[PDB]
Amino acid sequence: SVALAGNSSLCPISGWAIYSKDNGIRIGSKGDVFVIREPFISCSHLECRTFFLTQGALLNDKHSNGTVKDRSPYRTLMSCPVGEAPSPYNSRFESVAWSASACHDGISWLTIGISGPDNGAVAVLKYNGIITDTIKSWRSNILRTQESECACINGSCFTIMTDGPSNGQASYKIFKVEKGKVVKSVELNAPNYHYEECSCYPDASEVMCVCRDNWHGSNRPWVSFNQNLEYQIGYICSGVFGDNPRPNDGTGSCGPVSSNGAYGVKGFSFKYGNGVWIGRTKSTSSRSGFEMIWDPNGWTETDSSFSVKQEIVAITDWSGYSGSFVQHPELTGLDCMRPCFWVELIRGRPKENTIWTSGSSISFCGVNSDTVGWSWPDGAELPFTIDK
Amino acid sequence: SVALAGNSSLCPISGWAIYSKDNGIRIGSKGDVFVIREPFISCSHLECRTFFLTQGALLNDKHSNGTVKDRSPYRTLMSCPVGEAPSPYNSRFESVAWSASACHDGISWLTIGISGPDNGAVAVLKYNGIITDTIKSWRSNILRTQESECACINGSCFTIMTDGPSNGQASYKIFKVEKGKVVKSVELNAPNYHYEECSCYPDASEVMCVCRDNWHGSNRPWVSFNQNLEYQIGYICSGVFGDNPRPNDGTGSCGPVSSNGAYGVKGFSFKYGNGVWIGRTKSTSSRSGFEMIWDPNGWTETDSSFSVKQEIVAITDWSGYSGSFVQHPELTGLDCMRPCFWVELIRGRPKENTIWTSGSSISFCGVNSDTVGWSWPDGAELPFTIDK
Amino acid sequence: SVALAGNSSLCPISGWAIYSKDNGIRIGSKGDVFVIREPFISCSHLECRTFFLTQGALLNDKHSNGTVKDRSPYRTLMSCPVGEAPSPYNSRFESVAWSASACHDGISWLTIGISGPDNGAVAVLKYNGIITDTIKSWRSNILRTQESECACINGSCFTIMTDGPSNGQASYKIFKVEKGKVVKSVELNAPNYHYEECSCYPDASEVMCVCRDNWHGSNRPWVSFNQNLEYQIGYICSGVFGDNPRPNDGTGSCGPVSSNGAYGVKGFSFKYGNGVWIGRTKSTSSRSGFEMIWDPNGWTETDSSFSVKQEIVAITDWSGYSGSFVQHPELTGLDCMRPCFWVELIRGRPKENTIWTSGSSISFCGVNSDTVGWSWPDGAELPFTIDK
Amino acid sequence: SVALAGNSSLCPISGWAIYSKDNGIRIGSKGDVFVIREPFISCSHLECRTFFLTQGALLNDKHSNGTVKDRSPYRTLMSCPVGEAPSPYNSRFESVAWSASACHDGISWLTIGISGPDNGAVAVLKYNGIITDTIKSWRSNILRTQESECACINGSCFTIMTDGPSNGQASYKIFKVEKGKVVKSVELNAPNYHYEECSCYPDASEVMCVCRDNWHGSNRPWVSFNQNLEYQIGYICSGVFGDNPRPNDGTGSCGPVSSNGAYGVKGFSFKYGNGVWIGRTKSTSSRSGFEMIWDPNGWTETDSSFSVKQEIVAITDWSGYSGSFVQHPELTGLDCMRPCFWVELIRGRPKENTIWTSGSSISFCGVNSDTVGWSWPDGAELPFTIDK
Ligand SMILES: *[C@@H]1O[C@H](CO[C@@H]2O[C@@H](C)[C@@H](O)[C@@H](O)[C@@H]2O)[C@@H](O[C@@H]2O[C@H](CO)[C@@H](O)[C@H](O)[C@H]2NC(C)=O)[C@H](O)[C@H]1NC(C)=O
Ligand SMILES: *[C@@H]1O[C@H](CO[C@@H]2O[C@@H](C)[C@@H](O)[C@@H](O)[C@@H]2O)[C@@H](O[C@@H]2O[C@H](CO)[C@@H](O)[C@H](O)[C@H]2NC(C)=O)[C@H](O)[C@H]1NC(C)=O
Ligand SMILES: *[C@@H]1O[C@H](CO[C@@H]2O[C@@H](C)[C@@H](O)[C@@H](O)[C@@H]2O)[C@@H](O[C@@H]2O[C@H](CO)[C@@H](O)[C@H](O)[C@H]2NC(C)=O)[C@H](O)[C@H]1NC(C)=O
Ligand SMILES: *[C@@H]1O[C@H](CO[C@@H]2O[C@@H](C)[C@@H](O)[C@@H](O)[C@@H]2O)[C@@H](O[C@@H]2O[C@H](CO)[C@@H](O)[C@H](O)[C@H]2NC(C)=O)[C@H](O)[C@H]1NC(C)=O
Ligand SMILES: *[C@@H]1O[C@H](CO[C@@H]2O[C@@H](C)[C@@H](O)[C@@H](O)[C@@H]2O)[C@@H](O)[C@H](O)[C@H]1NC(C)=O
Ligand SMILES: *[C@@H]1O[C@H](CO[C@@H]2O[C@@H](C)[C@@H](O)[C@@H](O)[C@@H]2O)[C@@H](O)[C@H](O)[C@H]1NC(C)=O
Ligand SMILES: *[C@@H]1O[C@H](CO[C@@H]2O[C@@H](C)[C@@H](O)[C@@H](O)[C@@H]2O)[C@@H](O)[C@H](O)[C@H]1NC(C)=O
Ligand SMILES: *[C@@H]1O[C@H](CO[C@@H]2O[C@@H](C)[C@@H](O)[C@@H](O)[C@@H]2O)[C@@H](O)[C@H](O)[C@H]1NC(C)=O
Ligand SMILES: *[C@@H]1O[C@H](CO)[C@@H](O)[C@H](O)[C@H]1NC(C)=O
Ligand SMILES: *[C@@H]1O[C@H](CO)[C@@H](O)[C@H](O)[C@H]1NC(C)=O
Ligand SMILES: *[C@@H]1O[C@H](CO)[C@@H](O)[C@H](O)[C@H]1NC(C)=O
Ligand SMILES: *[C@@H]1O[C@H](CO)[C@@H](O)[C@H](O)[C@H]1NC(C)=O
Ligand SMILES: [Ca+2]
Ligand SMILES: [Ca+2]
Ligand SMILES: [Ca+2]
Ligand SMILES: [Ca+2]
Ligand SMILES: [Ca+2]
Ligand SMILES: [Ca+2]
Ligand SMILES: [Ca+2]
Ligand SMILES: [Ca+2]
């Protein structure tokens, strides 16, 4: 009926309250559950959903064998209610996709699903499930996108795509989409920067995206922009380094930190003035553990000092991708934009002795009331019957 | 649209008509059914639902192994339609929780889910699925709540939480909640009393809660209160003792009956003037059997005499927790508050030779027409394939 | 919103067009499907549903073992959409019941579920899922009802219950129900008659019920009545005998035909003037085959001549119970009452080498356009894995 | 509420964007998924659905054995949401059918399901699930229909049925249906032509159907007609031959091309002026591969030259039936009729070493933006556990 306004500011928060846990892998030991990756949450004005990519194989079946291309023609974007195990019996089909994003403008769902060959992949955009536009690769080298929700403000939704090497300079574009039609795009002028798998959120009528530098940055890049795609770029300055892998905390940089800068993990962070909430793994080397850190000057200053840490997953347990999501005033009844996040808990290959790899999910919302750290890990006992 | 009024009196009844039976365990021998505990029913102005806690494991799977903490990070509050087996394919996610309560104010669902560590657990309150408040532990010793429905009157919902020892004096609070926000709380001044797992129901614009004394009472404690949290406390006086374990019926007390007073089972009872409907197990020592007893003076007098008994489950079959639920006039069309109850039929450990423990459920509503006693037990044949 | 009027006459028809087939047993060889009996169809002003009784066990599981009481505390009335396999994942819970009826008045569903002991069983009546009344046994000898839909006319719904011997004279009552409350009942004065498992349908503001004589009739008894429960009784006169078992067709009677009169099968027939559509098995001795016969004088004349036969199930395949259902003008848009019927295809014990017994279903609607006979049998290949 | 107008022209397009992929077979290796054929898509003004025929057997079960009649009494038309694996837990029942069509007029669904014996089969027509008419065989030799969607224009829906030999001259009729009632039919005068399994679509208030000649044509026949059933017939003229099997491309004919003309595969094509979009297999001999070809003069000229080819499935992978579907302006918001297509990917017998045969599906919509060819095959690894 009416577009989400997108004009409120992020809510003042003090900590993170647990929102969901699906136990998808534990349930999938016996039930009929998809093998999934990137279980990103996104919400409308009425409800929240978990989106995910599947190869159309179930846990404990031979088709879950992971020695197959990530970018396969079987890969599909699907969604199910938040907190449920992702099954063929409760999941909706969204798009054929090996890279994706989705977001709700207040009226209907936009989904973006990229499929096709590496040298010519096409993003199919859908609005309320009907194809409304396509974007084809402009460098012929793996067109790819956020793997989390796009950001909507007053009926325009915004996303970021990358095309080019994942181990060197690439090309980055921002897209403005209305009723699933591309109305504007801009190519970033970002020499020496690298953007992948952006987590973008609206805040006071502009978008902020925090991304992954897979080339040569162990801190995270960011790009922010207004409704006309006039943008700014930088890297998060804090010495509390956000990517995985990374060095031990040390002197930061408002450009890419080259030490342990290659590879990465999808991640997010929330800017509050000169301060920043960072979610990151607990290990510097593997996707293990998860913590939220408040660094009151960490957006702009390069020291390694921070003031608050909240435990989310212990370093003895596997974590994985994570991303932002918001809950607008039209859903919550609040006067401010609520920040939330999800974490993927990756099980299986390469770290564990299975034929498959899947994630389960947890999610949290920021609140200004009492909270507590704990560890909420995946909890499945591997290997499974199919691995014997 | 409009809040439940909560101002009517309990319906005059003569007996208990059977309302539901889910056969969850029998079905879960082959189907994909959660291992559950505390299958409490609660209703809105339109429908009733069964809420429950799961560890996110299914029957007949290795993850159902019960030599694990009750208070785990895997534990979740879920709900499904009354009378259906609780499966990942028909259950909705509500909250991450190892102790919970839920209730509908006429407008939306309030859910309360407690997770986190023993020394600092946090109740996450949700209204229509959106986080609206948190309550953190105030004694740092296992914040916990009803495991049945909270009580709503004219848009305010009420619950009771405990924090402190389960084998000695603890601390008890009543909470008043509006649109999922705590608007008032009071700490009971109840020396020598013990409250756990309260069953609370509205009756004539006030709430009555009947609970479990785990310290030193084989009769049940109660607390009643008005909308401003001005309260009264006591224990049910009847010599028809309500808890399990308990002594043989004898002289009662309007304080805790110390004989066989340690441990307990979640239970309920309904006050009608000086009279009381008690639901209890049939065994004095184990959670076996279930019966409803009408004691016309049993709220206030300490004799062991009663006038009506209705069989629910035979003493040769396992029972478990039980709790109250009501059905308001906005749902039923009646001019009075309808009392109902559920019973959990616990199967597996510690009494039986399985690796797991789960409950199925039955429920009954009070009526003023003809009724009959019978035994409606769980009916599964144990052990299961996973226990071999 | 508005009650079904129930004042139209049965549609003129010439034959029977196939309406549904669920293939429940074939699907249940692998899927998670209830063991069921009496899959009766009933419709509202918007949709049709299949109701059924289950013991809360699934096909191919140990709990499906049939050497158990029919009248057990596990037995439940459930419903699912017409034409779907009856699973815990698509079925709704209605009532705890070992004998049942249901019907929709235009506004909400009435369900009637009988449970409890043989010497004191209680029918629980629900309207829109809320308990609205109870009827207790009046002879203390197996209170039981239709196992098919009740009949509704202008907001009053009507049913027939029996209490007493199934091998001798019993007691028969008609009940008039409004918003799930009994407003009137009458006991039939029917010496030497026997009524069980009535199929009742509305026609021109009155109800006609065709039933099973289990005592001493191989033709079917009937009772018809107006809104004030003023009734008439008889037996279908045709020599085309309707029950199973029965003798070969011969001279009929407008009283019970004693030859092969003991035992029976639930069945139906539709009166059109002095003429009758009879559905019956093809075998005189076992529940095998199914056919529809039009006998233009068969309501009132005792000859064995008929004019039309339409094959439904071949005599080489198992049939079972069958019952009427109607589709009112408020659902169909027609100016007349549409007659339909379902058939249960019974598989397993006692005729086949399994531990279990279940039915699948087929259904047909009367039409005045071209039709064709065929055989639409169950089609499962027995025995199943659990029987090995 | 309001009928689809059906008066717009096909959208100008340049290529085909991927719309769905269900991975039904891969998922059905472990989950509970029907064995299916003819997964045709059809849409309303609100949503799209996949319709299909099942024998009521699941993958990996003994009942999936394919040495059984295609025209069995077990065969049923069912439907599920586009892009989901077709399971008993997410599929709706539509009709008992071994040949079918369905379409939505803007108000409700029409379904047409043919069952019964070869010498007298009856199409049961339903509108909003209620039987509204029947059509019986007029040649007593396998009455059969489209196996894809019928075409609706301003409240009248249109379909084509065949009756007679599949290896010689037969009889062909067009039917006009309103609210599920046949209002008009015409028999084609088409000597030497053969029509089976028509794909029909509306375009500018008329219908075009492209079909399969099973007798003696390796090009496809067509019939077009207006709302009064005044018709024209021919064969697609292009030397880019459309059927399977077929000869190598060569000189075409605006009559049947006899070389490799016997047998066939259900297919479609879209007429744009004198030009045509043809979907066909890549192999000339087996149902392998799939491609879309634009031949700018191919409706009317017989040369073998074409200008655009888009890969859909590689020749090393199995394809199967394919059919048209449209998306009207009332669904899309466009000013033109959107052309789409589905393809069935047939796995199992006769080409592969299994006891069963099933299809999965992919679908595509025409767009005027950038697109790309690829191969999106079924992807299951055969044989399955049941075949061992
Ligand atoms: C933030 O925006 C709200 C909502 O703006 C309206 O809805 C949007 C989707 C878009 O359509 C806008 O153009 C609409 O005005 C603002 O609230 C509105 O303010 C206007 C101007 O005073 C007023 O007339 C409306 O009644 C308001 N609507 C509501 C529902 O309150 C709000 O002022 C903006 N806040 C800030 C801080 O920018
Ligand atoms: C019990 O309360 C009912 C309902 O009260 C209304 O709805 C509540 C949720 C709340 O909003 C109240 O403040 C509302 O009045 C009472 O019925 C109402 O009585 C008032 C006063 O006479 C009258 O104006 C309304 O029409 C009534 N509403 C309805 C639907 O009947 C009722 O009187 C109370 N009964 C008792 C015994 O206290
Ligand atoms: C059969 O009954 C219809 C409907 O009657 C109405 O709806 C019923 C549920 C009940 O509420 C009745 O008391 C209602 O009248 C009759 O149609 C109605 O006829 C009346 C009297 O002429 C007229 O005023 C209404 O408009 C009619 N309603 C509709 C929807 O047509 C109809 O006459 C009856 N037919 C026969 C043969 O008895
Ligand atoms: C195509 O048809 C549209 C819609 O026609 C209406 O809806 C149909 C289902 C049917 O009921 C028609 O008889 C209706 O007119 C035409 O648009 C309508 O045009 C009329 C005539 O000018 C106008 O009064 C209406 O407002 C229009 N309705 C809408 C929703 O725009 C349209 O003109 C037709 N287009 C062509 C090219 O034939
Ligand atoms: C897992 O898959 C591996 C290779 O698959 C091989 O590759 C796939 C893509 C197909 O081509 C398959 O037919 C090939 O054999 C195997 O090496 C491995 O054995 C597979 N199975 C396992 C690990 O159990
Ligand atoms: C059931 O679980 C028991 C112990 O689990 C042990 O504890 C759990 C929490 C994990 O740490 C597990 O890896 C440990 O082995 C076992 O003792 C027992 O064998 C388990 N399996 C059974 C009973 O089959
Ligand atoms: C099927 O059930 C039969 C008897 O059950 C016996 O009766 C039931 C009600 C229970 O009391 C059960 O524990 C008893 O053993 C058995 O005789 C029979 O073996 C059962 N199993 C089969 C046929 O596989
Ligand atoms: C598959 O089915 C084949 C024949 O079925 C035979 O035909 C069916 C219709 C039934 O009559 C069945 O009872 C008959 O045996 C068998 O030849 C074949 O063995 C079946 N099983 C397989 C291939 O595993
Ligand atoms: C929001 O978008 C609407 C519709 O395009 C436009 O009229 C309006 O001015 C926008 N509001 C703001 C505050 O930008
Ligand atoms: C019920 O709550 C409303 C809204 O807060 C208040 O105005 C009203 O007086 C309350 N009614 C009663 C009887 O307490
Ligand atoms: C139908 O029932 C209504 C409401 O009780 C009554 O007023 C009306 O007269 C009835 N109509 C007929 C035709 O009996
Ligand atoms: C569409 O059908 C309606 C209702 O039958 C008729 O009045 C109208 O003229 C039709 N419109 C056109 C353009 O044919
Ligand atoms: Ca990096
Ligand atoms: Ca700092
Ligand atoms: Ca105690
Ligand atoms: Ca007493
Ligand atoms: Ca008999
Ligand atoms: Ca006769
Ligand atoms: Ca051909
Ligand atoms: Ca050409």
mmCIF file with all atom_site columns, N, CA and C in Angstrom, chain B residues 348-376:
data_model
loop_
_atom_site.group_PDB
_atom_site.id
_atom_site.type_symbol
_atom_site.label_atom_id
_atom_site.label_alt_id
_atom_site.label_comp_id
_atom_site.label_asym_id
_atom_site.label_entity_id
_atom_site.label_seq_id
_atom_site.pdbx_PDB_ins_code
_atom_site.Cartn_x
_atom_site.Cartn_y
_atom_site.Cartn_z
_atom_site.occupancy
_atom_site.B_iso_or_equiv
_atom_site.pdbx_formal_charge
_atom_site.auth_seq_id
_atom_site.auth_comp_id
_atom_site.auth_asym_id
_atom_site.auth_atom_id
_atom_site.pdbx_PDB_model_num
ATOM 1  N N  . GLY B 1 348 ? 9.764   -41.761 27.969 1.00 0.00 ? 348 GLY B N  1
ATOM 2  C CA . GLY B 1 348 ? 11.207  -41.844 27.824 1.00 0.00 ? 348 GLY B CA 1
ATOM 3  C C  . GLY B 1 348 ? 11.929  -41.768 29.192 1.00 0.00 ? 348 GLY B C  1
ATOM 4  N N  . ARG B 1 349 ? 13.093  -41.142 29.214 1.00 0.00 ? 349 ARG B N  1
ATOM 5  C CA . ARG B 1 349 ? 13.844  -40.954 30.479 1.00 0.00 ? 349 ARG B CA 1
ATOM 6  C C  . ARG B 1 349 ? 13.116  -40.033 31.459 1.00 0.00 ? 349 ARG B C  1
ATOM 7  N N  . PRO B 1 350 ? 13.275  -40.272 32.785 1.00 0.00 ? 350 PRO B N  1
ATOM 8  C CA . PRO B 1 350 ? 14.151  -41.297 33.416 1.00 0.00 ? 350 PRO B CA 1
ATOM 9  C C  . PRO B 1 350 ? 13.473  -42.631 33.610 1.00 0.00 ? 350 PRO B C  1
ATOM 10 N N  . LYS B 1 351 ? 12.167  -42.718 33.363 1.00 0.00 ? 351 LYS B N  1
ATOM 11 C CA . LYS B 1 351 ? 11.398  -43.934 33.733 1.00 0.00 ? 351 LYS B CA 1
ATOM 12 C C  . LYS B 1 351 ? 11.461  -45.071 32.774 1.00 0.00 ? 351 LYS B C  1
ATOM 13 N N  . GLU B 1 352 ? 11.869  -44.802 31.540 1.00 0.00 ? 352 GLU B N  1
ATOM 14 C CA . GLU B 1 352 ? 11.803  -45.793 30.494 1.00 0.00 ? 352 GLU B CA 1
ATOM 15 C C  . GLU B 1 352 ? 13.128  -45.847 29.743 1.00 0.00 ? 352 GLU B C  1
ATOM 16 N N  . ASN B 1 353 ? 13.395  -47.034 28.976 1.00 0.00 ? 353 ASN B N  1
ATOM 17 C CA . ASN B 1 353 ? 14.715  -47.394 28.518 1.00 0.00 ? 353 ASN B CA 1
ATOM 18 C C  . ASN B 1 353 ? 15.007  -46.780 27.118 1.00 0.00 ? 353 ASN B C  1
ATOM 19 N N  . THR B 1 354 ? 15.062  -45.446 27.080 1.00 0.00 ? 354 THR B N  1
ATOM 20 C CA . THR B 1 354 ? 15.315  -44.729 25.834 1.00 0.00 ? 354 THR B CA 1
ATOM 21 C C  . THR B 1 354 ? 16.513  -43.763 26.021 1.00 0.00 ? 354 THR B C  1
ATOM 22 N N  . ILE B 1 355 ? 17.032  -43.194 24.934 1.00 0.00 ? 355 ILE B N  1
ATOM 23 C CA . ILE B 1 355 ? 18.045  -42.173 25.031 1.00 0.00 ? 355 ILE B CA 1
ATOM 24 C C  . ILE B 1 355 ? 17.405  -40.792 25.191 1.00 0.00 ? 355 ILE B C  1
ATOM 25 N N  . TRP B 1 356 ? 16.099  -40.713 24.926 1.00 0.00 ? 356 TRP B N  1
ATOM 26 C CA . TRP B 1 356 ? 15.399  -39.427 24.854 1.00 0.00 ? 356 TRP B CA 1
ATOM 27 C C  . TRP B 1 356 ? 14.251  -39.283 25.877 1.00 0.00 ? 356 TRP B C  1
ATOM 28 N N  . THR B 1 357 ? 13.705  -38.046 25.964 1.00 0.00 ? 357 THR B N  1
ATOM 29 C CA . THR B 1 357 ? 12.519  -37.801 26.695 1.00 0.00 ? 357 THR B CA 1
ATOM 30 C C  . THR B 1 357 ? 11.642  -36.817 25.878 1.00 0.00 ? 357 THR B C  1
ATOM 31 N N  . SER B 1 358 ? 10.375  -37.112 25.705 1.00 0.00 ? 358 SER B N  1
ATOM 32 C CA . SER B 1 358 ? 9.443   -36.163 25.082 1.00 0.00 ? 358 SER B CA 1
ATOM 33 C C  . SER B 1 358 ? 8.078   -36.280 25.762 1.00 0.00 ? 358 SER B C  1
ATOM 34 N N  . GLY B 1 359 ? 7.192   -35.332 25.460 1.00 0.00 ? 359 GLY B N  1
ATOM 35 C CA . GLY B 1 359 ? 5.767   -35.367 25.929 1.00 0.00 ? 359 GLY B CA 1
ATOM 36 C C  . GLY B 1 359 ? 4.834   -35.369 24.713 1.00 0.00 ? 359 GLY B C  1
ATOM 37 N N  . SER B 1 360 ? 3.670   -36.012 24.831 1.00 0.00 ? 360 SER B N  1
ATOM 38 C CA . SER B 1 360 ? 2.541   -35.711 23.962 1.00 0.00 ? 360 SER B CA 1
ATOM 39 C C  . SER B 1 360 ? 1.512   -34.913 24.800 1.00 0.00 ? 360 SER B C  1
ATOM 40 N N  . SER B 1 361 ? 0.385   -34.495 24.206 1.00 0.00 ? 361 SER B N  1
ATOM 41 C CA . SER B 1 361 ? -0.560  -33.715 24.991 1.00 0.00 ? 361 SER B CA 1
ATOM 42 C C  . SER B 1 361 ? -2.031  -34.141 24.831 1.00 0.00 ? 361 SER B C  1
ATOM 43 N N  . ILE B 1 362 ? -2.779  -33.834 25.893 1.00 0.00 ? 362 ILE B N  1
ATOM 44 C CA . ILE B 1 362 ? -4.238  -33.926 25.900 1.00 0.00 ? 362 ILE B CA 1
ATOM 45 C C  . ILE B 1 362 ? -4.713  -32.628 26.541 1.00 0.00 ? 362 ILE B C  1
ATOM 46 N N  . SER B 1 363 ? -5.934  -32.253 26.249 1.00 0.00 ? 363 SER B N  1
ATOM 47 C CA . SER B 1 363 ? -6.533  -31.058 26.881 1.00 0.00 ? 363 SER B CA 1
ATOM 48 C C  . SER B 1 363 ? -8.036  -31.214 27.011 1.00 0.00 ? 363 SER B C  1
ATOM 49 N N  . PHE B 1 364 ? -8.626  -30.434 27.940 1.00 0.00 ? 364 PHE B N  1
ATOM 50 C CA . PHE B 1 364 ? -10.036 -30.597 28.353 1.00 0.00 ? 364 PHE B CA 1
ATOM 51 C C  . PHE B 1 364 ? -10.570 -29.232 28.640 1.00 0.00 ? 364 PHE B C  1
ATOM 52 N N  . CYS B 1 365 ? -11.846 -29.022 28.457 1.00 0.00 ? 365 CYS B N  1
ATOM 53 C CA . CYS B 1 365 ? -12.510 -27.769 28.840 1.00 0.00 ? 365 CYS B CA 1
ATOM 54 C C  . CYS B 1 365 ? -13.622 -28.051 29.794 1.00 0.00 ? 365 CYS B C  1
ATOM 55 N N  . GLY B 1 366 ? -13.828 -27.123 30.736 1.00 0.00 ? 366 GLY B N  1
ATOM 56 C CA . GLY B 1 366 ? -14.892 -27.278 31.670 1.00 0.00 ? 366 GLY B CA 1
ATOM 57 C C  . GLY B 1 366 ? -16.224 -26.950 31.031 1.00 0.00 ? 366 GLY B C  1
ATOM 58 N N  . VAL B 1 367 ? -17.212 -27.808 31.303 1.00 0.00 ? 367 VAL B N  1
ATOM 59 C CA . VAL B 1 367 ? -18.564 -27.657 30.877 1.00 0.00 ? 367 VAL B CA 1
ATOM 60 C C  . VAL B 1 367 ? -19.584 -27.910 31.976 1.00 0.00 ? 367 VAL B C  1
ATOM 61 N N  . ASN B 1 368 ? -20.785 -27.362 31.768 1.00 0.00 ? 368 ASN B N  1
ATOM 62 C CA . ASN B 1 368 ? -21.906 -27.621 32.664 1.00 0.00 ? 368 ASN B CA 1
ATOM 63 C C  . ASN B 1 368 ? -22.921 -28.599 32.045 1.00 0.00 ? 368 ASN B C  1
ATOM 64 N N  . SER B 1 369 ? -22.469 -29.540 31.260 1.00 0.00 ? 369 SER B N  1
ATOM 65 C CA . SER B 1 369 ? -23.323 -30.566 30.682 1.00 0.00 ? 369 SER B CA 1
ATOM 66 C C  . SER B 1 369 ? -22.666 -31.914 31.042 1.00 0.00 ? 369 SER B C  1
ATOM 67 N N  . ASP B 1 370 ? -23.211 -32.998 30.538 1.00 0.00 ? 370 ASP B N  1
ATOM 68 C CA . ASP B 1 370 ? -22.742 -34.355 30.925 1.00 0.00 ? 370 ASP B CA 1
ATOM 69 C C  . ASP B 1 370 ? -21.344 -34.629 30.422 1.00 0.00 ? 370 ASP B C  1
ATOM 70 N N  . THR B 1 371 ? -20.574 -35.370 31.269 1.00 0.00 ? 371 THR B N  1
ATOM 71 C CA . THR B 1 371 ? -19.184 -35.651 30.978 1.00 0.00 ? 371 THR B CA 1
ATOM 72 C C  . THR B 1 371 ? -18.900 -37.039 31.478 1.00 0.00 ? 371 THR B C  1
ATOM 73 N N  . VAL B 1 372 ? -17.708 -37.512 31.218 1.00 0.00 ? 372 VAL B N  1
ATOM 74 C CA . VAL B 1 372 ? -17.332 -38.858 31.649 1.00 0.00 ? 372 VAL B CA 1
ATOM 75 C C  . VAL B 1 372 ? -15.824 -38.973 31.863 1.00 0.00 ? 372 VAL B C  1
ATOM 76 N N  . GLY B 1 373 ? -15.452 -39.741 32.864 1.00 0.00 ? 373 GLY B N  1
ATOM 77 C CA . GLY B 1 373 ? -14.037 -40.076 33.068 1.00 0.00 ? 373 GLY B CA 1
ATOM 78 C C  . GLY B 1 373 ? -13.604 -41.207 32.144 1.00 0.00 ? 373 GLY B C  1
ATOM 79 N N  . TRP B 1 374 ? -12.324 -41.187 31.790 1.00 0.00 ? 374 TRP B N  1
ATOM 80 C CA . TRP B 1 374 ? -11.707 -42.270 31.070 1.00 0.00 ? 374 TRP B CA 1
ATOM 81 C C  . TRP B 1 374 ? -10.205 -42.152 31.232 1.00 0.00 ? 374 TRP B C  1
ATOM 82 N N  . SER B 1 375 ? -9.442  -42.929 30.493 1.00 0.00 ? 375 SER B N  1
ATOM 83 C CA . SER B 1 375 ? -7.996  -42.760 30.429 1.00 0.00 ? 375 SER B CA 1
ATOM 84 C C  . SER B 1 375 ? -7.636  -42.490 29.006 1.00 0.00 ? 375 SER B C  1
ATOM 85 N N  . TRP B 1 376 ? -6.987  -41.336 28.759 1.00 0.00 ? 376 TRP B N  1
ATOM 86 C CA . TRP B 1 376 ? -6.496  -41.005 27.446 1.00 0.00 ? 376 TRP B CA 1
ATOM 87 C C  . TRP B 1 376 ? -4.983  -40.820 27.482 1.00 0.00 ? 376 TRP B C  1
#
